[PDB]
């Protein structure tokens, strides 16, 4: 995620911190969303590998 | 219609513009509260650190002439303002970029220059309109201006202590009434290696980098100071002279009598009551003789050799003591007095002279600079000098502007609406001009790590009713009322920047071709 956000030109520290906090409890598939520039349930966003 | 036969002029113009823009972007990093300094290694083998643009460009050995004009521009701005050298050169770059745009935009450069003149007239009018008159007597606003200029170089490290340093120094050197342009050379700067930048100190007095010459006297109290120019040695005439020895008593008569002559010298010196001696360079001929040093140390007189001729005026201004160049004129009337004078010991053994407290308060003042790295010390003194310059600028015009690019976006907005009002291709010119001014906030956001375009656009939108008080804030990382964040720079800074840049861009547009010479 850090490289993703850096190539996205974001403050990946805010993204990472929110990521860890939300991802301790709130749902498995939260992760970086490029266009919304913050966390999203990418699984429902259909980012499927 | 008319046909343009040649294309060499246009191509050379383009080359110059590209060079200027490249130089601008090279400088672009070092700017603003988020500024990042550079380092240059001399081909000689010297190394320097710098964040100020003028020193950067002077260390540049630029090849392409256009950027050499840019360097000269920065030199002029520094000899006028002190910071904004970065700002003025970056404005130059953006202006020439829009000039390119206008060149493939087919408009002849002369019309561009005239429109630019109209643009700068509008801009100067707006800038004069927006400022806040501020009396020189208000210390805190002075302090805010200082810390505004300071927190852009490395010395932001101890900004909190360096700002009162500078402001107090200037207040002590100015006349707080005449509002003249009090000279900076009245401020003495001392590069003393070692120590900590925190340990930088003000000396309300006189400091000499030279070392004592008496072995035994280090501290003197209630000392009376006297500065003497005529040498203390065997009398050697301006024109060629020589003692002839042919006889018997000649030997001892000589020896005894140069002793007697030196004795008369020193005895009169004491009879005046002086206890601290100052002697200038006399490289042309004999300096202070050793025997006279023996007498003086015997009579317990503080003594110093090797005073530079350029320092004499500063010294006499500071300690209030006119020199003496002949025995007779040396009289207790002219002996200056100071509360204390002695040789401090720092650097482990790097020893320095201080003379604190003088009953005749000279308007001048000195600064002691400390720190570990030699390079960081040089950068610190540069920044302090810039602080003094900006304070002097504020003295020149008792007007104040909140910094943080807000004046510039104000300028962009007003000039854009002005261009919309004014018809003709000059309208296109002025629109380019405003888009050129748009750059500084963009750079501020970039070095702030914020989304530049979104921030700039939102800041314009705010500023549509969010007048110059509001602007880009670093500490909060967003847009707020900068004035309440206490980040303000004098009107003269950006005014001079705009004026100089405009004249240089007009001159550049006049250029068409470069001819190699012999």
């Amino acid at each position: 995620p850090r490289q993703l956000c850096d190539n996205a030109g974001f403050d990946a520290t805010n993204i990472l911190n929110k990521l860890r906090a939300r991802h301790a409890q709130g749902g498995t598939w939260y992760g970086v969303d490029i266009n919304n520039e913050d966390i999203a349930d990418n699984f429902e966003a259909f980012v499927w590998e | 219609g008319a046909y343009q036969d040649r294309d060499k002029p246009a191509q050379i113009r383009f080359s110059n513009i590209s060079a200027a823009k490249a130089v601008a972007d090279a400088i672009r990093t070092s700017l603003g509260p988020k500024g990042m300094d550079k380092m240059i290694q001399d081909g000689k083998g010297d190394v320097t650190i710098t964040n100020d643009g003028a020193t950067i460009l002077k260390q540049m050995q630029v090849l392409h002439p256009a950027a050499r004009m840019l360097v000269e521009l920065s030199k002029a701005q520094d000899i006028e303002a002190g910071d904004g050298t970065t700002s003025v050169v970056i404005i130059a770059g953006s202006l020439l970029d829009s000039c390119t745009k206008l060149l493939q935009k087919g408009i002849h450069p002369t019309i561009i220059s005239e429109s630019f003149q109209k643009a700068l007239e509008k801009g100067i009018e707006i800038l004069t309109d927006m400022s806040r008159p501020v009396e020189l007597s208000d210390r805190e606003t002075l302090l805010n201006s200082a810390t505004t200029s300071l927190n852009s170089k490395v010395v932001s490290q101890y900004s909190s202590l360096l700002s009162p340093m500078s402001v107090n120094a200037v207040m002590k050197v100015i006349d707080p009434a005449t509002a003249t342009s009090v000279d900076l050379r009245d401020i003495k700067i001392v590069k003393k290696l070692g120590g900590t930048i925190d340990d930088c100190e003000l000396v309300e007095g006189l400091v000499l980098t030279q070392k004592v010459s008496n072995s035994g006297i280090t501290r003197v109290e209630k000392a009376k100071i006297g500065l003497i120019q005529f040498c203390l040695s065997a009398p050697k005439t301006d024109m060629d002279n020589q003692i002839v020895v042919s006889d018997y008593a000649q030997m001892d008569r000589v020896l005894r009598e140069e002793r007697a002559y030196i004795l008369n010298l020193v005895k009169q010196i004491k009879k005046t009551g002086c206890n601290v001696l100052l002697i200038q360079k006399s490289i042309l001929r004999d300096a202070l003789s050793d025997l006279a040093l023996h007498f003086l140390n015997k009579m317990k007189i503080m003594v110093i050799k090797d005073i530079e001729r350029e320092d004499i005026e500063f010294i006499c201004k500071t300690i209030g003591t006119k020199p003496v160049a002949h025995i007779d004129q040396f009289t207790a009337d002219m002996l200056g007095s100071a509360e204390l004078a002695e040789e401090v010991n720092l650097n482990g053994s790097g020893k320095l002279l201080k003379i604190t407290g003088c009953a005749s308060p000279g308007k001048t003042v000195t600064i002691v600079v400390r720190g570990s790295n030699k390079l960081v010390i040089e950068e610190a003194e540069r920044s302090i000098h810039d602080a003094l310059c900006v304070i002097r600028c504020l003295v020149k015009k008792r007007a104040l502007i909140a910094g943080g690019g807000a004046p510039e976006i104000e300028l962009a907005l007003r000039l854009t609406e002005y261009s919309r009002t004014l018809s003709g291709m000059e309208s296109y010119c002025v629109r380019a001009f405003a888009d050129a001014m748009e750059v500084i906030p963009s750079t501020l956001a970039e070095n702030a790590g914020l989304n530049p375009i979104s921030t700039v656009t939102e800041l314009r939108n705010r500023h549509a009713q969010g007048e110059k008080t509001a602007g880009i804030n670093v500490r909060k990382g967003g847009i707020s009322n900068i004035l309440e964040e206490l980040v303000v720079q004098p009107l003269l800074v950006s005014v001079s920047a705009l004026t100089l840049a405009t004249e240089t861009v007009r001159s550049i547009l006049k250029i068409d071709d470069v001819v190699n010479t012999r």
Binding site: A8 | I107, V439, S442, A445, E446, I453
Partner: protein, 527 residues
């Protein structure tokens, strides 16, 4: 700890430029290409002259050729060269300005990067803008589908596309030439045409106006035997690939004559076989013959003896052009040759075209021929080659029109309206892609500017007036009066262009520059 180490060999000389510096360098290079190309656009445009490595020269306006002959070294210059090649051999002219679009777009892209916009969003916005542009373009398209038999909408189109090449001297005539040729060789039931059926042929000499299409095939050989009659009225044609020689099975073979009578029989056979083949060709009812390969001189005479002129050493493609033009077949033996396979034509006549040089052969076939040739004449070898390339591009554009029968009036009005539509959408853009929109519009705005610049007019007064008119009125039929005629109605001026042309041009340029933005890092090995 601190010590140098080898990562990539030649580590000293493997240079590298990365990030924004690299991008700006690339944009500089692309802009240099754009400036080199700008002057070649428009009827008022000026063309280039190239110097071959081997010291040969070439004057041309076709941007594809311009970049092809170029010896570039910086990579993205190569990318633009390949760009132009692809665009041309897909469409035709337009390469007159495709790289121009590329360069202006990349320039304005750099304008955006200076404001720190990340390139990827720029690429995405440019793609959106391109889609909008093409959909507005084909909304405002005119069509020639509803046209009557397409005689001179096609003629007008050729007239347009030839306004850029020096062959414009009699370009009316060459317009009729191109349209007649393609209409003859078109397969309307398929919507294609193979240019192999088109025989481009330029022989130096004479005027330029002398250039003439020949409903037939022209062959670079004279008659096999000089004494044969120069003209033939009938055109009973025979097409043969077996050389007029005693047959030799190409398996490694050779006879073993032993006796007196053996050799005598072989000697008899030698002339008997020639007599046999002569009788065969005569009884076939043919009048004229063509052979792929050389002759034995003896059969050459005997053929002369029976009033059957023929041609020797004819290259393949020319041969099959003969066959299709005459409706004949290619026969591999004398024995299987019959009258039905014989080719027919109206008139065949050798031409001593050159005043002092060897001759040519023309077949003025008179029935329908799915093949045709163009014969180009003029005073310069270079002008000959330029005519070749120009006419080839004209044929390409008419072919494209066959592929799609809807066009747009040229003169820049099209992309002008495209830019206006883009600007209109830019208000419902929202965020940062908005700058991408207005960016792409302003960049696209270049072509009218370049046209006017080559027109010597003040470019921007003209283009502003154009925008004002095309806004106040709804006609997307107002470009730039390139040839100084007081009407900006290029529809009346007939300055027209295929939808496919501009559409492919803009989409291709969008993808190309999208990749150009897509790159950041370069590692050049030192030469």
């Amino acid at each position: 700890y601190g010590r140098p180490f080898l990562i990539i060999k030649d580590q000293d000389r493997k240079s590298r430029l990365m990030g924004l510096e690299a991008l700006k360098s690339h944009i500089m290079a692309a802009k240099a290409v754009a400036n080199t190309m700008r002057t070649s656009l428009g009827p008022n445009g000026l063309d280039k002259m190239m110097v071959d490595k081997d010291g040969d020269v070439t004057v041309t306006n076709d941007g594809a050729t311009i970049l092809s002959m170029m010896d570039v070294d910086h990579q993205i210059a190569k990318l633009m060269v390949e760009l132009s090649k692809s665009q041309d051999d897909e469409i035709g002219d337009g390469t007159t300005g495709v790289v121009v679009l590329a360069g202006a777009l990349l320039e304005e892209a750099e304008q955006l990067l200076d404001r720190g916009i990340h390139p990827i969003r720029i690429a995405d916005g440019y793609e959106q803008a391109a889609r909008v542009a093409i959909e507005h373009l084909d909304k405002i398209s005119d069509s020639v589908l509803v046209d009557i038999k397409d005689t001179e909408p096609l003629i007008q189109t050729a007239k347009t596309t030839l306004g850029s090449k020096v062959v414009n001297s009699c370009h009316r005539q060459m317009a009729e030439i191109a349209v007649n040729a393609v209409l003859t060789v078109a397969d309307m039931e398929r919507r294609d045409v193979d240019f192999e059926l088109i025989k481009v042929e330029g022989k130096v000499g004479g005027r330029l106006e002398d250039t003439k299409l020949i409903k037939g095939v022209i062959v670079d050989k004279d008659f096999s035997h000089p004494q044969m009659p120069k003209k033939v009225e009938d055109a009973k044609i025979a097409i043969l690939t077996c050389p007029f020689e005693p047959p030799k099975p190409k398996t490694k073979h050779k006879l073993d004559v032993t006796s007196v009578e053996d050799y005598k029989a072989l000697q008899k056979y030698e002339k008997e076989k020639f007599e046999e083949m002569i009788q065969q060709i005569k009884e076939t009812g043919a009048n004229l013959a063509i052979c792929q390969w050389g002759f034995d001189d003896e059969a050459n005479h005997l053929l002369l003896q029976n009033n059957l002129p023929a041609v020797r050493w004819v290259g393949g493609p020319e041969i099959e052009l003969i066959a299709i033009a005459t409706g004949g077949r290619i026969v591999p033996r004398f024995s299987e040759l019959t009258a039905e396979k014989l080719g027919f034509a109206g008139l065949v006549q050798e031409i001593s075209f050159g005043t002092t040089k060897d001759k040519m052969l023309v077949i003025e076939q008179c029935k329908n021929s799915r093949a045709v040739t163009i014969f180009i004449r003029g005073g310069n070898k270079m002008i000959i080659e330029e005519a070749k390339r120009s006419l080839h591009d004209a044929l390409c554009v008419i072919r494209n029109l066959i592929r799609d029968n809807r066009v747009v009036y040229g003169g820049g009005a099209a992309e002008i309206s495209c830019a206006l539509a883009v600007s209109q959408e830019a208000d419902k853009c929202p965020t940062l892609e908005q700058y991408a929109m207005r960016a792409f519009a302003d960049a696209l705005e270049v072509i009218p500017m370049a046209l006017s610049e080559n027109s010597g007019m003040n470019p921007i007064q003209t283009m502003t007036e154009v925008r004002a008119r095309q806004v106040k009125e709804m006609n997307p039929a107002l470009g730039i009066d390139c040839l100084h005629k007081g009407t900006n109605d290029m529809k009346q001026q007939h300055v027209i262009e295929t939808l496919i042309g501009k559409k492919q041009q803009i989409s291709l340029a969008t993808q190309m520059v999208r990749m150009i933005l897509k790159i950041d890092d370069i590692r050049k090995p030192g030469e």
